[PDB]
């Protein structure tokens, strides 16, 4: 047996890339260690695809073994936990790098086998997944880097530890290729637009050492490239329920292109709006009798019914996590029933949308010194047509004020889209479920003073920081418009 | 946004019907509030049915949110609970109102969003489901009413509260249309046949105010009616295992009609019995060595092996329910394995049959003052050919006496069927799995003195109370015959 | 109703065979009681098989009812437990007795309905399953006997009780027909090869009274035999990943026969080895930073990453089992991911392989007097190509020594195969995943002095004890070769 080991300095720590010894039957297997935090990541891609497979099947499995921290599992935790699904989501969000037409089934399995309580295994697993896909031979336009950005003493900190974080005003996670940023997931204490954008650029520049070191391992121990080639080559309908039913022609690529051009040229959108227009808002407070705090927020065809519950300090959820024991005082829940889009089925991505809406509200939540009560917020999505997660942020803010929770300020969220081909681009405000037919979509949540949460999902090459500068500026004026309408129905708690 | 609100007095309380504001993407969504008990009920019916769908797909989902009582969920309760499935069953049992030939997939989702501890959300959810289906436009021959009937001081009480119930001798739930009763589910402290029938008629008369007020909301805010039209138009085999195997012709509507007429005319049934004849009974006691209390009850081709277990007061199941904390001292379990009907599969309706058999025994169970021990009863269905739930009632009574539990009296159950077309009708005693091919089926469980449980399922228009008067009278003499045979093998506890 | 009862003396106890009274709708149902330990076993075989069914579907369901011990189930235990799946596996391992070409779906359901704390229901369930299949009429070349063999005071004890076991040096379970042994599952305190083989022969001779008494019940109350007749009638590829991919011809019985003859004649195996050659070994210790005890064991194309965890006496798993309360101080876990064989899927037989590897290590584990700490061992199968369970035994031994656990000696495991047709036979050492294409496969785990675990799976008629004598002797020299290589990398704990 022969192990190929390559080491490098990523920020403060030393990252070890190991392959060729363990799990050889898989397409590629990489042992990535970052100061004693080791995550074993594997990748398997099937040679022949199922004849007439309509979509690209990608599954990312992230699992935390408790023996990594030197502890024996308890009578309690088959099914993955809430946190494990979120980190598997952070990895998956590598998906748009597979070439268009690639339909082979591919599974990425990342297991935490050793852990340091100060080094978060989520970045380690993302580096391992990037190394596995690049060494595999499977058509993949990487490798990507993985970076966590902090903000201590008005300066950006690369990969802050759990102790450093406590002093940080930002918990940003950024992933992207050598050319452009692809994934961003941020949590912030009401920071400005430039401070959030500065962290995205900073993290993308610092993660370049990860991409270079994987590329060298690829040239040294990488398997040959796959023998795969791609196969050679409703206007006035505003209501989503009425549009989708009459669009079912007996007889997708043309459906994108027609909407694409009718926004690039600069004419009315699908529903009939200008590029920076927000849908009709309906705000209601105190809608359910026998609850503490309740709120109904409606934005065009997207609606969320949100509630708040006050409990004692003993009602706090004690989460036994791998990194350490953690007591959660603020709880957030997200429900997405099939009737929200007019469908029948099982009573998705609820964990991802729930945490995103939680991060948009967490920054404005009061201290345990001023408010020593366990607060739980549940969002019920009654209607969905564009970003029900940001509607939960608005609904939570009104529900907390209805309950009597003295939050620092009012908080709102907004979804933004972007269409680009040449030098000309258009940033759209309050996008419809427009989301599929685009280049990038990003959600900004924050108060009147700053930003609490920022999520980005880019799929196009060559987005400049000047284009994102303008994109966040329109997003700022978008949420200020929502907060102005919110400020009228409910302004103060109790 | 525009909410349409209609209020009315249902009994003691005020019922609010609200629609047109929440969940507009669904076919219909109704917010029903009864004195601070609010259940949000939605309905979605697909426009086009799956080509060549053989059965009518109906799914009722009832869920209780804990924030309704102003409480935060605990580390414990995806899957619905035992009580939530039973209430979803109470709603579902609306099914025979969809026109014959309607095969479109339709899902009804009812969620308890606000709750008053004195007003049971189960009746509230049934009113909401009746309002949703009527406002939807989906072919549905309603609306139905929902009523709970109590019996305090020899007088019928409409919708008794949780405190009133404690003084009631009856917990009856009745649902039906403006013309006839459709669903009954009763629990009683050994009441007479006329007292049980009087409650069914009383509840059907009182629930008429619900039907009228939904109908007015339908005329005001109801969506247009659906553009749907229906498509235009083994004798001596007594053994069920031998009949079903040889009936599989290579080559259902004719199979019903042939049995229908051969009972309407007045000739021997499928197995060869008269209309009021009970199958062969086999009663055995003390059949398992290392149990407390054990009993084997056989009725023709239906068999149940039942056991009893004695435990301390600490072994009682503490059920944290939405309405309040509840300690259960009498436990009942029901098992329906695939071999009971000669099939292979997963190791259905066990919760419904388990509670029905529990309600048939609960009335005869001794007090905690005379018997302060936690008693658990488990029924194992070894054979099934007609009503294994009533066989569990007989089996439980013998198992309790074998264990040494001093029950008030012996208790037995019987399933009854009815075939009707003109003025001539025939009520059948101890029906075979005859159940599918009929108009109504009802199960009566009780002692020699009174009735402990009464369940009804009607699917035909125009059943008079005089026909039910005769039907319950034959059911009385049926269980007295079973109790006479039971009284011989086991007569006294200890 | 008429029950047919036959009783006989099996060893110390009295075994009751009862049929014809309970569950008549099933193909056959038997009530088997062994001194108050009663297990109700049913069998259902469908008459017509699904047109073009490619494999034989057999499902064994073993379930333990808690009312059997006279106890009421607690708020805790749908899904079967760890122990229930293992006993269902002990029954299933009857499978090779169904004639070749029999493809009908058949389910065997065994339920423990009464239990004596001194008589293990696992042997009782195996007798019941043998009686059910023989009385059914379903083509089945039985009946089989079921025997547990102990070793107290240098003498073999038939069916030792739970108290006797404590004094036994062996916990062997043996099942087979009147002609030959079929299934063996052993746990031993470092016993010699002849002592283990002597127990297999002893148990097969003692279980003959079970086969004879079932056969008499078959002649008395057995259903007629089924009207079923059978339908009338890559050399140098060493790498498993390279062989399986290029073997997929467009165009199994010939694939077996070609390998069969090329081993019977006496020429190089599929990978190119002699009959008694072991694959290349790679042993590594201390491979994961932030664990207690860690080990990587590689054997050709089979690899296992194993870890050990040290905890306090309070961290011990308290297993509330049917026979009694049991505290487990040594924990073993087994993981089989899809990438171990180069596949994509859900993240099988892990419980069976986990317990087999546990039994191979349990004998060498130190006492609670010398080492009063809870030890947990987890095996991660990174590569699989022949017997990843025995690779876990080797990996566990090195991981315990790395953790500092003072185990009595070093322990290793080896998988063995056998090919036979005439008087000439060949026993193979360290078989590849060769396992499907054979007559019997057996795994021997033990130290330098004795044997800790012995599992056998025979599918052929006429294996003499002299052939097994030679087979275990080659297995002895096989594990001594592995222990010699292991003894070099890691020799002492701490």
Residue numbers in the entry:
A (entry chain A), B (entry chain A), C (entry chain A): 2 to 78, 82 to 97, 99 to 238, 257 to 274, 298 to 393, 398 to 483, 485 to 545
Task: Copy text from the publication.
One widely occurring ribonuclease with such multi-functional versatility is polynucleotide phosphorylase, a phosphorolytic exoribonuclease (PNPase; polyribonucleotide nucleotidyltransferase; EC 2.7.7.8).5,6 PNPase processively cleaves single-stranded RNA substrates in the 3′-to-5′ direction using inorganic phosphate to attack the phosphoester linkage at the 3′ terminus and liberate nucleoside diphosphate. E. coli PNPase core forms a homotrimer with a ring-like architecture that encloses a large central channel. The two RNase PH-like domains within each protomer are spatially related by a pseudo-dyad axis, so that the PNPase trimer has approximate dihedral symmetry D3. In the current study, we solved several crystal structures of E. coli PNPase core bound to its cognate RNase E micro-domain, including a complex with O2′-methyl-modified RNA bound and another with manganese in the active site.
